[PDB]
């Protein structure tokens, strides 16, 4: 498109409401079966963008100087099996300072109110 030097629009077409659920063909899969318990992974990350026209955020990922490189567990990811005891009514427990590093929100200079 033209107009203003910015973005471009996409075309739309009315197809069908077919959902991408389970495949009805045959009835088999192709997934793994184990991946044995044992942290044997150096750096097998992926890269899609380019550092030249995007910046950082390519290598420094998932490396928090807390309980990640030290191979320890604090009070964050405490999710075992779904068959814990099934589920009843949720409550929402307390928290602790230091377990929620990332926190990006929106605010206004005047007045200072919470947005989204």
């Amino acid at each position: 498109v033209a107009g203003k030097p910015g973005d471009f629009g996409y075309c739309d077409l009315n197809y069908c409401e077919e959902a991408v659920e389970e495949e009805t063909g045959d009835g088999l899969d192709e997934d793994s079966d184990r991946a044995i318990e044992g942290r044997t992974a150096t750096s097998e990350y992926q890269t899609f963008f380019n550092p030249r026209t995007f910046g950082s955020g390519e290598a420094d990922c998932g490396l928090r100087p807390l309980f990640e490189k030290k191979s320890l567990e604090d009070k964050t990811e405490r999710e075992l099996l779904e068959s814990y005891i099934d589920g009843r009514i949720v409550e929402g427990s307390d928290a602790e300072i230091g377990m929620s590093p990332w926190q990006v929100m929106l605010f206004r200079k005047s007045p200072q109110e919470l947005l989204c």
Binding site: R34, A35, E37, R39, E73, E77, E79, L80, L81, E82
Partner: protein
């Protein structure tokens, strides 16, 4: 319980001591060995009546391995009944172990009685019983070929006999002498047994002390915490 045996021969290899038992267990695979959850050890009971003429090593009796060629122990009832014997754990007379369990013994009793018979075989228990079929029966009845399994909790105090009611060669010598005592829980404070209630002075580490630094136990150990949640018991 699925007893295994040689497939080259059918009836002669069983008499030569080529028979055992296999545990085709369910989906309680915890580690590389499979921790039997809600279970313990195993106590079996085999009674196979065979003969030397039935085994393949008949030549290692009266002809080759022999030192009396002038008098052959054949065509006589003495040498015939000397081979007709009922064995248990490789012990024809009596076994070296006893059935004296204790409390909190979620073991799985197994029974088998192969041989040259075809009908059903039974055994009467005096003063002792078992648990099967969501009930509490006294005696049971096994079957040949396949193996019979039953989870029995042995809770009793005293000593009695476990004789059968038949004719004479299988009712007069098929008894069992053992003493079952539990004073007070599992009886491990002043006796000798491979159990522990514990119920004693525990100032450090003893039995039933599952304190692990990462995580104690739950269902499996697929990862450091198991993140895929789909633990079934077969094909969904």
């Amino acid at each position: 319980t699925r007893p295994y045996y040689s497939d080259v021969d059918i009836m002669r290899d069983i008499a030569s001591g080529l028979i055992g038992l296999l545990l085709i267990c369910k989906s309680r695979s915890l580690d590389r060995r499979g921790i039997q959850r809600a279970a313990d050890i195993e106590q079996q009971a085999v009674f196979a009546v065979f003969d030397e003429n039935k085994s393949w090593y008949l030549e290692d009796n009266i002809n080759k391995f022999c030192e009396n060629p002038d008098e052959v122990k054949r065509d006589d009832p003495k040498f015939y009944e000397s081979n007709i014997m009922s064995t248990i754990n490789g012990y024809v007379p009596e076994s070296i172990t006893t059935l004296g369990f204790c409390f909190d013994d979620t073991v799985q009793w197994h029974f088998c009685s192969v041989g040259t018979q075809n009908e059903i075989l039974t055994i009467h228990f005096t003063g002792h019983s078992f648990i099967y079929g969501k009930r509490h029966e006294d005696t049971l009845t096994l079957f040949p070929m396949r193996g019979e399994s039953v989870t029995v909790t042995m809770d009793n105090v005293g000593t009695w006999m476990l004789t059968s009611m038949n004719s004479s060669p299988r009712s007069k010598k098929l008894r069992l002498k053992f003493r079952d005592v539990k004073c007070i829980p599992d009886d491990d404070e002043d006796s000798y047994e491979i159990f522990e209630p514990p119920e004693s002075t525990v100032m450090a580490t003893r039995k039933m002390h599952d304190r692990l630094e990462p995580e104690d136990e739950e269902s499996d150990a697929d990862y450091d915490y198991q993140n895929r949640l789909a633990a079934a018991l077969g094909i969904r």
